[PDB]
């Protein structure tokens, strides 16, 4: 069966773009990771940065 996309149809009938960011159940080594933060540099001080 085919579609029916016309301006007459209101909200709920316009196509929606969907992307699924699924992942393997943590069995293989991690190859994708999120962004990492950063910190300025301090010289000769009892700082743990």
């Amino acid at each position, epitope marked *: 069966r085919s579609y029916s996309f*016309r*301006p*007459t149809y*209101g*909200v709920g009938h316009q196509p929606y773009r969907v992307v699924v960011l699924s992942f393997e159940l943590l069995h293989a080594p991690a190859t994708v990771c999120g962004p990492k933060k950063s910190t300025n540099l301090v010289k000769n001080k009892c700082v743990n940065f």
Partner: antibody
Amino acid sequence: QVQLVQSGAEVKKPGASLKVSCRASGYTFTSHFIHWVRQAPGQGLEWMGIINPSGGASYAQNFRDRVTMTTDPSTSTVYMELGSLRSEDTAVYYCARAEGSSWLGWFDPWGQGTLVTVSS
Amino acid sequence: SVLTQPPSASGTPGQRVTIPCSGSSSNIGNNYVYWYQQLPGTAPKLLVYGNNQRPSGVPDRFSVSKSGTSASLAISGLRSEDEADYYCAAWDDGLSGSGWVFGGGTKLTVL
């Protein structure tokens, strides 16, 4: 001249049909979409139908299944047929046009408007 | 009739004229606002589009601002010829149908 000409609604009889011809001049027909506007006395603007220069069409939600409306890219003219008249027809109708991309577009052409009055 | 517009506006002479156009976030917050000036007995004409670009030949006496989900039109130095009709145009999504629903109409009276 760049103008959209539409014939006004004349007097008729119950059980008949009203034919309105909208013609575009001064520019190519396959360059702007065709749009319907309604304005009642002492009221704002309402829109009924859409006819693309070349493609499908969008009818009127309220006036569906009883209005004949199509397109013909030969004489750059369109014909609208109305049946089952009612007192709600008393308004002014604009057979206007819009941009060639819809949505965010400029309504450069305007029509003179047809005064439709139905009474008993 | 979801949109609300004042029936009329009144004020003392010599005061700036402020007209608020407030709706929802779908037509103003998420979409551009079109500002039309309509003459009595004449078809509406687009004057302000996009809130960023303006047609040439339009004096800057009128001012328009957008705050939150609302907009305000401010006119300084009101004159007797400023009595006209003003329309807000935006794309709205309705339960019956989604489209370009315009305003009803504002009428001004000068004594």
